Amino acid sequence: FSFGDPCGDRFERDTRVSLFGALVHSRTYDMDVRLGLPPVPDNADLSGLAIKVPPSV
Amino acid sequence: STLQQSLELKRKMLRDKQNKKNSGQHLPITLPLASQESAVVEDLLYVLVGVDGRYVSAQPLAGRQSRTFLVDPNLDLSIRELVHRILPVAASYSAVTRFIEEKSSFEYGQVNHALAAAMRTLVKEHLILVSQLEQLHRQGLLSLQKLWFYIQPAMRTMDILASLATSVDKGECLGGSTLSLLHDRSFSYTGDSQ
Amino acid sequence: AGRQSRTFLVDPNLDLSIRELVHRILPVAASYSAVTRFIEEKSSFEYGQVNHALAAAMRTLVKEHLILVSQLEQLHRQGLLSLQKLWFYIQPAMRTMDILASLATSVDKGECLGGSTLSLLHDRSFSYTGDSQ
Amino acid sequence: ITEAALVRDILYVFQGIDGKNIKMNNTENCYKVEGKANLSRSLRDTAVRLSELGWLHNKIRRYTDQRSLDRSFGLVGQSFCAALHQELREYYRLLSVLHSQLQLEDDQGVNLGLESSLTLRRLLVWTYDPKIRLKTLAALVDHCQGRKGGELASAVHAYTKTGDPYMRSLVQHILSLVSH
């Protein structure tokens, strides 16, 4: 009668924390989280906008 | 659009790879200066998403070219030139996003699909950046000079991505030919660490 | 009217989207009402040990449903309950109650008793081969 | 039209419900924004992008309703429908989370021009990957349309080779669930 907690399958866990893949750069278990995006970096007006490379780890 | 070429690449890669993949996995199936600035910001935030603005409207894409835009002639010449300098980044973004979204299909094989997926992920990061810039504009923190400065690296990144996309599309590179093209491009970016 | 699912009248002046969401949720409440009616009726000693036990299990599940509903009521009283959150939380519960109500209605249509009831339960258990829950 | 009203309409479309200013165009099988002049062309395109998600949702729900009633789908067909319904439940949970975030944005009332604020563009960004996921699921449903039994199994086996790692993982999970 519940959406079973995605504790088991890594794919299910990521789906839950990504909201079925909706979340891009964040993961959360909290349902009351206020969704925010990363702030604009302070050097964007100085250095331009760099393509953020995802860390290899 | 780059999406149609990328989808065709997917279908081609699926056929060629099925013959190549002995592995039995079938592929899945009058305006005030501030008001002019605000309107251009709105158009760019739309253009950053590939949507025509009120004062800046996109021209139809001719071939595997970057999207062209029609700008209202009544804009400041300096503003219009800055817009035309930044718009290449948004055009490259729109073409790259179309290619990324189409060629990420299983038919393009895991290699071409992954290349398109990586392009889509970087386009997603670009969209996040653009949304933050839109927020700054809504916050009033985005100036035209700050916008130009911030997009200059973004402009260069989008131009590099568009050049890579156009090279892949012109070469119809698939699989090992695509891997060769990727190697050659990696050597071509010897001077560009990013 | 008869052995039908409970029907509801909603105020016509409600938002069309709200009205449609209500009509989407109301099926769960109709299933709940039907299940509760079946449980309360077949709970009579006259129903035999098998039907009585079935009703008792249904009553236990209804109690669990009531507990869930009370927690959701608390969230609303806490102001923590949105309509979409309610819909999401009840969707699996809605499906569970609907499955239970369909089973109850099938047993009632078959008037299954004793060994025939056990056979029907076995066949229903095979019918849920695709639904692990 | 207020941005909040567009958000409400988009949330309804995600539920398959017509908004006050955005209604489902059955001819396009998508929600269409009412032709009131004050909708920005950019806003119209964003609404269309969200209605693509609503179209996928409606397609999924149509499939689930079509197959839940078909006893003839057999145990494998029922398992496939169950997997689709489970993915739909996950999708609805995600949509509920997004709705709760929209409700939080409505409750806070401030057009905070912070990079964290839920903008229609920001909403579109946050749902872009979910939109791709839903598009993939809809394409899978279309490819598996009319298949049952071993034909459904063959369609599932074909779906495991997807290049998208997220799609690949999803299809692997679906294959395991249908093979159970």
Curated annotation (Swiss-Prot), chain B:
UniProt note on tissues of expression: Ubiquitously expressed.
Result of changing R156C: In CDCBM15; uncertain significance
Cellular localization per UniProt: Cytoplasm, Cytoskeleton, Microtubule organizing center, Centrosome
Function recorded in the entry: Component of the gamma-tubulin ring complex (gTuRC) which mediates microtubule nucleation. The gTuRC regulates the minus-end nucleation of alpha-beta tubulin heterodimers that grow into microtubule protafilaments, a critical step in centrosome duplication and spindle formation. Plays a role in neuronal migration.
Family per record: Belongs to the TUBGCP family.
Disease involvement: Cortical dysplasia, complex, with other brain malformations 15: An autosomal recessive disorder characterized by global developmental delay, variably impaired intellectual development, speech delay, facial dysmorphism, microcephaly, and varying degrees of cortical malformations including pachygyria, thin corpus callosum and subcortical band heterotopia. Most patients have generalized seizures.
Quaternary organization: Component of the gamma-tubulin ring complex (gTuRC) consisting of TUBGCP2, TUBGCP3, TUBGCP4, TUBGCP5 and TUBGCP6 and gamma-tubulin TUBG1 or TUBG2. TUBGCP2, TUBGCP3, TUBGCP4, TUBGCP5 and TUBGCP6 assemble in a 5:5:2:1:1 stoichiometry; each is associated with a gamma-tubulin, thereby arranging 14 gamma-tubulins in a helical manner. Gamma-tubulin at the first position is blocked by TUBGCP3 at the last position, allowing 13 protafilaments to grow into a microtubule.
The name this protein goes by in its record: Gamma-tubulin complex component 2
Name of encoding gene: TUBGCP2
UniProtKB/Swiss-Prot annotation, chain D:
Cellular location(s): Cytoplasm, Cytoskeleton, Microtubule organizing center, Centrosome
Coiled-coil residue windows: none
Tissue-specific expression: Ubiquitously expressed.
Stated role: Component of the gamma-tubulin ring complex (gTuRC) which mediates microtubule nucleation. The gTuRC regulates the minus-end nucleation of alpha-beta tubulin heterodimers that grow into microtubule protafilaments, a critical step in centrosome duplication and spindle formation.
Similarity-based family: Belongs to the TUBGCP family.
Subunit composition and interactions: Component of the gamma-tubulin ring complex (gTuRC) consisting of TUBGCP2, TUBGCP3, TUBGCP4, TUBGCP5 and TUBGCP6 and gamma-tubulin TUBG1 or TUBG2. TUBGCP2, TUBGCP3, TUBGCP4, TUBGCP5 and TUBGCP6 assemble in a 5:5:2:1:1 stoichiometry; each is associated with a gamma-tubulin, thereby arranging 14 gamma-tubulins in a helical manner. Gamma-tubulin at the first position is blocked by TUBGCP3 at the last position, allowing 13 protafilaments to grow into a microtubule.
This protein's name: Gamma-tubulin complex component 3
Organism: Homo sapiens
Lineage: Eukaryota, Metazoa, Chordata, Craniata, Vertebrata
Gene from which the chain derives: TUBGCP3
Residues of the full protein shown: 245 to 424 of 907
